[PDB]
Design an enzyme around this catalytic site. Structure first.
Site, PDB file in Angstrom:
ATOM      1  N   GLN D  11       0.775  -1.339  -0.099  1.00 47.99           N
ATOM      2  CA  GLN D  11       0.232   0.065  -0.120  1.00 47.99           C
ATOM      3  C   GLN D  11       1.010   1.332  -0.025  1.00 47.99           C
ATOM      4  O   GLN D  11       0.627   2.067  -0.844  1.00 47.99           O
ATOM      5  CB  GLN D  11      -0.906  -0.156   1.163  1.00 47.99           C
ATOM      6  CG  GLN D  11      -1.767  -1.229   1.426  1.00 47.99           C
ATOM      7  CD  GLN D  11      -2.174  -1.369   2.616  1.00 47.99           C
ATOM      8  OE1 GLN D  11      -1.484  -1.768   3.933  1.00 47.99           O
ATOM      9  NE2 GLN D  11      -3.512  -0.802   2.868  1.00 47.99           N
ATOM     10  N   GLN D  15       0.800   3.853  -3.126  1.00 44.19           N
ATOM     11  CA  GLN D  15       0.318   5.450  -2.987  1.00 44.19           C
ATOM     12  C   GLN D  15       1.576   6.458  -3.071  1.00 44.19           C
ATOM     13  O   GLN D  15       1.045   7.497  -3.449  1.00 44.19           O
ATOM     14  CB  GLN D  15      -0.170   5.424  -1.612  1.00 44.19           C
ATOM     15  CG  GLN D  15       0.491   5.017  -0.255  1.00 44.19           C
ATOM     16  CD  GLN D  15       1.128   6.664   0.239  1.00 44.19           C
ATOM     17  OE1 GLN D  15       0.705   7.553   0.115  1.00 44.19           O
ATOM     18  NE2 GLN D  15       2.355   6.432   0.720  1.00 44.19           N
ATOM     19  N   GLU D  64      -3.484  -7.151  -2.017  1.00 41.28           N
ATOM     20  CA  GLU D  64      -4.772  -6.742  -2.092  1.00 41.28           C
ATOM     21  C   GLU D  64      -4.996  -5.503  -3.101  1.00 41.28           C
ATOM     22  O   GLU D  64      -4.315  -4.779  -3.369  1.00 41.28           O
ATOM     23  CB  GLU D  64      -4.913  -6.259  -0.528  1.00 41.28           C
ATOM     24  CG  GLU D  64      -4.398  -5.039  -0.335  1.00 41.28           C
ATOM     25  CD  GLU D  64      -5.078  -3.764  -0.339  1.00 41.28           C
ATOM     26  OE1 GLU D  64      -6.340  -3.868  -0.397  1.00 41.28           O
ATOM     27  OE2 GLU D  64      -4.408  -2.621  -0.393  1.00 41.28           O
ATOM     28  N   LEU D 245      23.458   8.250 -12.246  1.00 34.16           N
ATOM     29  CA  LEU D 245      23.092   7.604 -11.233  1.00 34.16           C
ATOM     30  C   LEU D 245      24.099   6.208 -10.703  1.00 34.16           C
ATOM     31  O   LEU D 245      24.168   6.170  -9.589  1.00 34.16           O
ATOM     32  CB  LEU D 245      21.776   6.610 -11.753  1.00 34.16           C
ATOM     33  CG  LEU D 245      21.014   5.770 -10.597  1.00 34.16           C
ATOM     34  CD1 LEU D 245      20.491   6.818  -9.394  1.00 34.16           C
ATOM     35  CD2 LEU D 245      20.105   5.184 -11.264  1.00 34.16           C
ATOM     36  N   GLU D 247      27.468   7.054 -10.980  1.00 39.11           N
ATOM     37  CA  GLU D 247      28.405   8.185 -10.160  1.00 39.11           C
ATOM     38  C   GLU D 247      27.881   8.531  -9.039  1.00 39.11           C
ATOM     39  O   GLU D 247      28.816   8.603  -8.113  1.00 39.11           O
ATOM     40  CB  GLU D 247      28.432   9.616 -11.271  1.00 39.11           C
ATOM     41  CG  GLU D 247      29.222  10.566 -10.584  1.00 39.11           C
ATOM     42  CD  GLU D 247      29.247  11.751 -11.590  1.00 39.11           C
ATOM     43  OE1 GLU D 247      28.463  11.866 -12.518  1.00 39.11           O
ATOM     44  OE2 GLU D 247      29.808  12.916 -10.982  1.00 39.11           O
TER      45      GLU D 247
HETATM   46  N1  LIG Z   1       5.839   7.558   5.172  1.00 39.30           N
HETATM   47  C1  LIG Z   1       4.829   6.933   4.886  1.00 39.30           C
HETATM   48  N2  LIG Z   1       4.613   5.384   5.366  1.00 39.30           N
HETATM   49  C2  LIG Z   1       3.436   4.733   4.963  1.00 39.30           C
HETATM   50  C3  LIG Z   1       2.439   5.128   4.068  1.00 39.30           C
HETATM   51  N3  LIG Z   1       1.513   4.115   3.890  1.00 39.30           N
HETATM   52  C4  LIG Z   1       1.995   3.186   5.011  1.00 39.30           C
HETATM   53  N4  LIG Z   1       3.169   3.338   5.368  1.00 39.30           N
HETATM   54  C5  LIG Z   1       3.965   2.418   6.375  1.00 39.30           C
HETATM   55  O1  LIG Z   1       3.481   1.365   5.964  1.00 39.30           O
HETATM   56  C6  LIG Z   1       3.460   0.375   7.541  1.00 39.30           C
HETATM   57  C7  LIG Z   1       2.381  -0.559   7.523  1.00 39.30           C
HETATM   58  O2  LIG Z   1       2.675  -1.231   6.429  1.00 39.30           O
HETATM   59  P1  LIG Z   1       0.934  -1.395   5.536  1.00 39.30           P
HETATM   60  O3  LIG Z   1       0.182  -0.451   5.843  1.00 39.30           O
HETATM   61  O4  LIG Z   1       0.637  -2.539   5.831  1.00 39.30           O
HETATM   62  O5  LIG Z   1       1.249  -1.250   3.869  1.00 39.30           O
HETATM   63  P2  LIG Z   1       1.814  -2.802   3.113  1.00 39.30           P
HETATM   64  O6  LIG Z   1       3.520  -2.358   2.856  1.00 39.30           O
HETATM   65  O7  LIG Z   1       1.142  -3.073   2.228  1.00 39.30           O
HETATM   66  O8  LIG Z   1       1.851  -3.862   4.092  1.00 39.30           O
HETATM   67  P3  LIG Z   1       0.440  -4.982   3.853  1.00 39.30           P
HETATM   68  O9  LIG Z   1      -0.824  -4.270   4.205  1.00 39.30           O
HETATM   69  O10 LIG Z   1       0.296  -6.177   4.921  1.00 39.30           O
HETATM   70  O11 LIG Z   1       0.370  -5.833   2.405  1.00 39.30           O
HETATM   71  C8  LIG Z   1       3.250   1.625   8.445  1.00 39.30           C
HETATM   72  O12 LIG Z   1       4.083   1.191   9.616  1.00 39.30           O
HETATM   73  C9  LIG Z   1       3.783   2.905   7.829  1.00 39.30           C
HETATM   74  O13 LIG Z   1       4.858   3.310   8.353  1.00 39.30           O
HETATM   75  C10 LIG Z   1       2.586   6.530   3.684  1.00 39.30           C
HETATM   76  O14 LIG Z   1       1.877   6.937   3.078  1.00 39.30           O
HETATM   77  N5  LIG Z   1       3.822   7.081   4.063  1.00 39.30           N
HETATM   78 MG   LIG Z   2      -0.889  -3.973   2.166  1.00 42.99          MG
END
Ligand SMILES: Nc1nc2c(ncn2[C@@H]2O[C@H](COP(=O)(O)OP(=O)(O)OP(=O)(O)O)[C@@H](O)[C@H]2O)c(=O)[nH]1
Ligand SMILES: [Mg+2]
Ligand SMILES: CC(=O)O[C@H]1C(=O)[C@@]2(C)[C@H]([C@H](OC(=O)c3ccccc3)[C@]3(O)C[C@H](OC(=O)[C@H](O)[C@@H](NC(=O)c4ccccc4)c4ccccc4)C(C)=C1C3(C)C)[C@]1(OC(C)=O)CO[C@@H]1C[C@@H]2O
Ligand SMILES: Nc1nc2c(ncn2[C@@H]2O[C@H](COP(=O)(O)OP(=O)(O)OP(=O)(O)O)[C@@H](O)[C@H]2O)c(=O)[nH]1
Ligand SMILES: Nc1nc2c(ncn2[C@@H]2O[C@H](COP(=O)(O)OP(=O)(O)O)[C@@H](O)[C@H]2O)c(=O)[nH]1
Ligand SMILES: [Mg+2]
EC number: 3.6.5.-
Lengths: 426, 430, 120, 430
Positions: D11, D15, D64, D245, D247
């Site tokens: 996620q 994003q 997902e 990159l 370098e």
């Molecule tokens: N800085 C930042 N960290 C994010 C953001 N979205 C998620 N995270 C980090 O993602 C961590 C948790 O992972 P998830 O929210 O579960 O996302 P994922 O990598 O897809 O893991 P799964 O949902 O299990 O598939 C959190 O502790 C956040 O630090 C974001 O928009 N900005």
């Molecule tokens: Mg996820």
């Protein structure tokens, strides 16, 4: 000038051939009523290859529609282009074959072979310079596999020198719709190997795999499989109906594509293939056509080429392109994947290019391949035959037609011989 | 006077003819309709009628009609005598067998008939310029049948051979070496000087020199036409040192069987590139011996030169030719056989090269035609012989050749003959 | 008799080539022999006749390196009855340590073989 | 030329991709539909078709669908190639186990398939820009499976790692250190330069500098996008000192295992604040070393600098860079390791920073990208190792990892590896 005479056998054969007729009538700009409506004169010079010139500048295809039931004839004549066909080539019986090879080859189709021969002979004498016969049929059931082989043997007997290319949709284990298909396939390939100069093996399962995993159709009907077949149907004969820089008619393919006389069951394919929402994003350049073309997903049989070695591959390209990239992809494919091509024969590819691309397409590529992996369908058909051969089921419906056990034994022996030759060079 | 009958066999032959005559009509100033708007410089290649029409002395022979009846539709449909361009009914199927025994048999008699009706107006017929491809079925079989009868009906006349030869890597058909090997008897026995053309080497030429990323075979043709016109330059225009077509081949040939010289053309250069160079005689002389300019993918530095012919044309002074060849003999990297310390034959012509308006070649005041025999060219056959073994070791595709009336042992005589040729080109290098 | 090759044989072979008078400047051998033109110069000392040096051109692009080495395989190695696969040749052309030396070891032995042979 | 394939996993990855491409389309002037209203500055990141459409070379992989099919509904639904954005059926359950063995196994083969079909048009592919989160199940497991196969299929290509790292205090899941520790083998063995992102430190950044009391993660994203674009600034636009990159990463990396630099961006400042400052090169240079501007909650004053890279962009004169770095080396509070008395790598680009219209960042004529490796960052792992002990000492949640096909001892190899890394970053500081 290199006239080519078409024959339809079975419901599968005549419907896919009818949709092929529709496709190439659009390519040649032929009205449903038979009149010419094309845009350029390029559609007009080689009309004699597929159609007969008649009064009123209307054109009748050189097709002989053969079946053992009138229902399929009724459907095809009432179809989109039923009216363009000859009323005389609708040669048909009344009682069906019941998916019985013996019925079609001895009783039901033997009475109609006289009525098909007098039509095919008149069609051939109507030609200026006959090149061959393209025959569409099905290895499943007893109509297409049954009478198709008989009349193929007859035309081979009386036309020994003409090209014999057949496009055969053939049975499969997981998308089997009839119980008694393997008998039909074993009794059909027996004659196909001995008589046909060319056979294109088409498997329905890989057509389904194309329409889901590449075309992304949610409901691809049977006509879509017919369309996928007809694409290569039109592609394989493109060079002798249109100009191109590298002209390669059927015998041009033949001299390059079948190293030994019996190794002539081949692998068709066509590119490009996209879903409706993905053609907007694709770059249709020739290298991408190539990367799509030798993909195991683009092929129309379950025989995965990675389980064997390519003997010869034919890439008949089409469209206004140069050709140095054509050579570079055709050498890169066989160099980086040299483990999938017989190293003992160095240049496995035959290259052909046409100048006019298909209507609506800027370019197109048609795939024809000789791989030792095609034995996957043959040995599986033999194994399924053995599972219904070794201790006598269903034979009363063949032996009741005058069929005999020892001929079944020789048919199985010949399937084993074929799979032996195709494993020999792997 | 000084007429030459050009033969065009196969798709490659007929289309290279379409490009050559495209060049000839422009350089001699004939419209595509055959007329002369307003010297007998055209008598070498074109015949004249009472109405003021230029009729080429050429035959287009193809066992299939598509390319030739395409010519019947092109801009040159009216330039040519329609029934001196002969079409068959059945294609050659890339097969030497049918082209040499089966399908060309019924059509060759008309071909020689038209050759005779082209010979009977030539008062000073000099030689023959036949074009084909080794790998093609027509260019192999029909040429093999045709030089046989030409060598007995026109035995005295010279027969120059301009043939298109397969690449070490680039290939269009799997049966190409089969067609190429049965052609070797024709060049050895029924040819006087053969010129071999490699598509991949000239692909590299157009990639590097012309700067064009995407040329077609038409670009290949619009330089093969220049090489053949430059070879025929002395016969058609005036020059300080005009080289007769017999003089030429006497200067090339050391022995009757050693008559297979390479060809290169200079300056092959794009229009954007012609501006920044003065393009002296010396550099076009130096560029020809560069292996990156050879027409066949073989390294001349791997071999030894026997005969060298400097076919200059344009604004070239023979003193500059002597000055250039002094430098050429100065470097050791170009080692000539101990046969020819004289080295060089010099031919100068006053006509500058003629540019195709749609071509990719630049307009240059000077042009040189390089034709040289060398022992390095045996490598271009040293991969084809090992190639032919790699198919014949199972009898790879012979059932077609057997099925069309060829003796099985004709392959044995074929590779025996190529081995004899390969040996012959090695002993002379000592 | 040493069944396998030790580290000392490398040094012996390193010194021997220097022992021959070769028209080459001061540079390492493992990067010069990789070119290929040096190998035929080595063999010039033994039989000047078979060596032509009108056939291989010194460059420093891998394409010319391999093009020269392939030629050398079929015009010098064949006379010495010596055959090597392309997989090895690739490595020689890459200036691979140990690889070209594995051919330098038997090369001299083959040359001395030819010396002893009573050729007429 | 100079193409880079961006990977987006989990996620967080998908994003942060949505925000990055939002920045890229604006800075390169592409509409959300992919068109160019009216230089090849986009070839580094976007591919071009015949119809005049810019297609990004990016993959969105999430086990997902919710976030990605949300992207299929957003304004960028038509910008992306729909089946290069891959969705699974079962979420990763914040579990490295299923993401690395169970659920990502069936989908990774399609991911590498799309990576190959993205590589085959890149003529000058420079490297990979993969985005994920350590704590997430997908960003841990699927990335761990993916770099393994990328390192054997694209071993020569550089693989930059931009990962989101847990905070010392702020956390969203209890299993986050479990996912983070099994990621450490991937960065050490299958990564070339990893960039770690802490949410709490940048929370402090936006609290203090941007004056915004209530930003979302989207504000975090609209500055991670700036940091990655600034790292890629030299590859896409012209500059007096453009840093390749390769370098770049050669200048960062002292040893193959020491490739974990911090990142900071300047000037992070609100629109109301940009007006009252002249914002010279010196102060943006001084602001970067301030521990209140670090992206990871570690004090650089607690550690020693090894490599320093000055990635300036905008209206910056290199003389001012030299004048600033003289002051930087003047103060003793910033003590560099005895490795690098040369200290600083300087990179200047002519493109001013591009502002997001909905962003909270001010428009400034100058922007600098700070990337530096230091020994102080081991503290960001010095609390995570003690953290992992605090769970593993009972086998806190391992039955899930055991139940999904992970060996129990893989935790033992994991903390052994992090201890090795922690030691490796301490000896070099002497
Ligand atoms: N800085 C930042 N960290 C994010 C953001 N979205 C998620 N995270 C980090 O993602 C961590 C948790 O992972 P998830 O929210 O579960 O996302 P994922 O990598 O897809 O893991 P799964 O949902 O299990 O598939 C959190 O502790 C956040 O630090 C974001 O928009 N900005
Ligand atoms: Mg996820
Ligand atoms: C707007 C647009 O660009 O759409 C194109 C198109 O390129 C796509 C969608 C077409 C489209 O085809 C299909 O949707 C299809 C469905 C089931 C089975 C086969 C095709 C198209 O229908 C097919 C059609 O192709 C042709 O017209 C060819 O000449 C083809 N003839 C036919 O498909 C045909 C259709 C109806 C009636 C008669 C013929 C052909 C191919 C090989 C040899 C001879 C003829 C074209 C360009 C399109 C549409 C209209 C969407 C595709 O078709 C072909 C054969 O090229 C499917 O994948 C290819 C490439 C593209 O994705
Ligand atoms: N250089 C060059 N070679 C050509 C050209 N056209 C054809 N060839 C050569 O011709 C070879 C194959 O022969 P074909 O294309 O079959 O032509 P053909 O001689 O008429 O032989 P058939 O078709 O069997 O009658 C190829 O390998 C090409 O090298 C051309 O325009 N330029
Ligand atoms: N690819 C394809 N397969 C078909 C089509 N129609 C039927 N089939 C299958 O092909 C097999 C051929 O058998 P069939 O033609 O009915 O036997 P016949 O009546 O004796 O000719 C059948 O079992 C069908 O399942 C079609 O339109 N396309
Ligand atoms: Mg031909």
């Amino acid at each position: 000038m290199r006239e080519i005479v078409h024959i339809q056998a079975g419901q599968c054969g005549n419907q896919i051939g009818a949709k092929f007729w529709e496709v190439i009538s659009d390519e040649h700009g032929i009205d449903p009523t038979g009149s010419y409506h094309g845009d350029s004169d390029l559609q007009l010079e080689r009309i004699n290859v597929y159609y007969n010139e008649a009064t009123g500048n209307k054109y009748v295809p050189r097709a002989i529609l053969v079946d053992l039931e009138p229902g399929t004839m009724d459907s095809v004549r009432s179809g989109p282009f039923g009216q363009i066909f000859r009323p005389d080539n609708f040669v048909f019986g009344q009682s069906g074959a019941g998916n019985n090879w013996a019925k079609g080859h001895y009783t039901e189709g033997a009475e109609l072979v006289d009525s098909v021969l007098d039509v095919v002979r008149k069609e051939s004498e109507s030609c200026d310079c006959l090149q061959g016969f393209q025959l569409t049929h099905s290895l499943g059931g007893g109509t297409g596999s049954g009478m198709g082989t008989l009349l193929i043997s007859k035309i081979r007997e009386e036309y020994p020198d003409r090209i014999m290319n057949t496009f055969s949709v053939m049975p499969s284990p997981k998308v089997s719709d009839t119980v008694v298909e393997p008998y039909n396939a074993t009794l059909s390939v027996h004659q196909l190997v001995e008589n046909t100069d060319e056979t294109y093996s088409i498997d329905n399962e890989a057509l389904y795999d194309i329409c889901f995993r590449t075309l992304k159709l949610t409901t691809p009907t049977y006509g879509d499989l017919n369309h996928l077949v007809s694409a290569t149907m039109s592609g394989v004969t493109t060079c002798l109906r249109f100009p191109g820089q590298l002209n390669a008619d059927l015998r041009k393919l033949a001299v390059n594509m079948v190293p030994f006389p019996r190794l002539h069951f081949f692998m068709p394919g066509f590119a490009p293939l996209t879903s409706r929402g993905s053609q907007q994003y694709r770059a249709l350049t020739v290298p991408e056509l190539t990367q799509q073309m030798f993909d195991s997903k683009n092929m129309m049989a379950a025989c995965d080429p990675r389980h064997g070695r390519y003997l010869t591959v034919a890439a008949i390209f089409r469209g206004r392109m140069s050709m140095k990239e054509v050579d570079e992809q055709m050498l890169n494919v066989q160099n980086k994947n040299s483990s999938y091509f017989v190293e003992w024969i160095p240049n496995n590819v035959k290259t052909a290019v046409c100048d006019i691309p298909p209507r609506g397409l800027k370019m197109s590529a048609t795939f024809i391949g000789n791989s030792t992996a095609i034995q996957e369908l043959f040995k599986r058909i033999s194994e399924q035959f053995t599972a219904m051969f070794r201790r006598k089921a269903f034979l009363h419906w063949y032996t009741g037609e005058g069929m005999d056990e020892m001929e079944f034994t020789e048919a199985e022996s010949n399937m084993n011989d074929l799979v032996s030759e195709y494993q020999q060079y792997q | 006077m000084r007429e030459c009958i050009s033969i065009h066999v196969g798709q490659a032959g007929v289309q290279i003819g379409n490009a050559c005559w495209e060049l000839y009509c422009l350089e001699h100033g004939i419209q595509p309709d055959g007329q002369m708007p307003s010297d007998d410089s055209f008598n070498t290649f074109f015949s004249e009628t009472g109405a003021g029409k230029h009729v080429p002395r050429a035959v287009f022979v193809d066992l299939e009609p598509t390319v030739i009846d395409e010519v019947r539709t092109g801009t040159y449909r009216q330039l040519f005598h329609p029934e001196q361009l002969i079409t068959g009914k059945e294609d050659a199927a890339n097969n030497y067998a049918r082209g040499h025994y089966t399908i060309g048999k019924e059509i060759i008699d008309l071909v020689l008939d038209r050759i005779r009706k082209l010979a009977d107006q030539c008062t000073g017929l000099q030689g023959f310029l036949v074009f084909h491809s080794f790998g093609g079925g027509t260019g192999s079989g029909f040429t093999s049948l045709l030089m046989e009868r030409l060598s007995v009906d026109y035995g005295k006349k010279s027969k120059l051979e301009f043939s298109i030869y397969p690449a070490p890597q680039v290939s269009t058909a799997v049966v190409e070496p089969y067609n190429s090997i049965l052609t070797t008897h024709t060049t050895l026995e029924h040819s006087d000087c053969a010129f071999m053309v490699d598509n991949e080497a000239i692909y590299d030429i157009c990639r590097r020199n012309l700067d064009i990323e995407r040329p077609t075979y038409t670009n290949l043709n619009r330089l093969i036409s220049q090489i053949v016109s430059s070879i025929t330059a002395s016969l058609r225009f005036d020059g300080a040192l005009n080289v007769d077509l017999t003089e030429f081949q006497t200067n090339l040939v050391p022995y009757p069987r050693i008559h297979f010289p390479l060809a290169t053309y200079a300056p092959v250069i794009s229009a954007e590139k012609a501006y920044h160079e003065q393009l002296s005689v010396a550099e076009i002389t130096n560029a020809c011996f560069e292996p990156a300019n050879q027409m066949v993918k073989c390294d001349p530095r791997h071999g030894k030169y026997m005969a060298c012919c400097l076919l200059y044309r344009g604004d070239v002074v023979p003193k500059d030719v002597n000055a250039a060849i002094a430098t050429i003999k100065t470097k050791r990297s170009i080692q000539f056989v101990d046969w020819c310390p004289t080295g060089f034959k010099v031919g100068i012509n006053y006509q500058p090269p003629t540019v195709v308006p749609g071509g990719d070649l630049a307009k240059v005041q000077r042009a040189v035609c390089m034709l040289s025999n060398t022992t390095a060219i045996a490598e271009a056959w040293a991969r084809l012989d090992h190639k032919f073994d790699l198919m014949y070791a199972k009898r790879a595709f012979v059932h077609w050749y057997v099925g069309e009336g060829m003796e099985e042992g004709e392959f044995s005589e074929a590779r025996e003959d190529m081995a004899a040729l390969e040996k012959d080109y090695e002993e002379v290098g000592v | 008799m040493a069944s396998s090759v030790d580290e000392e044989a490398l040094h012996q072979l390193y010194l021997w080539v220097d022992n021959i008078p070769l028209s080459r400047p001061k540079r390492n051998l493992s990067r010069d022999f990789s070119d290929g033109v040096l190998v035929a110069e080595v063999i010039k000392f033994y039989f000047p006749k078979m060596v032509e040096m009108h056939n291989y051109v010194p460059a420093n692009s891998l394409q010319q390196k391999l093009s020269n080495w392939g030629h050398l395989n079929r015009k010098v190695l064949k006379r010495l009855n010596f055959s090597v696969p392309d997989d090895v040749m690739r490595k020689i052309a890459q200036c691979a340590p140990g690889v070209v030396e594995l051919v330098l070891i038997p090369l001299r032995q083959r040359l001395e073989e030819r010396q002893r042979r009573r050729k007429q």
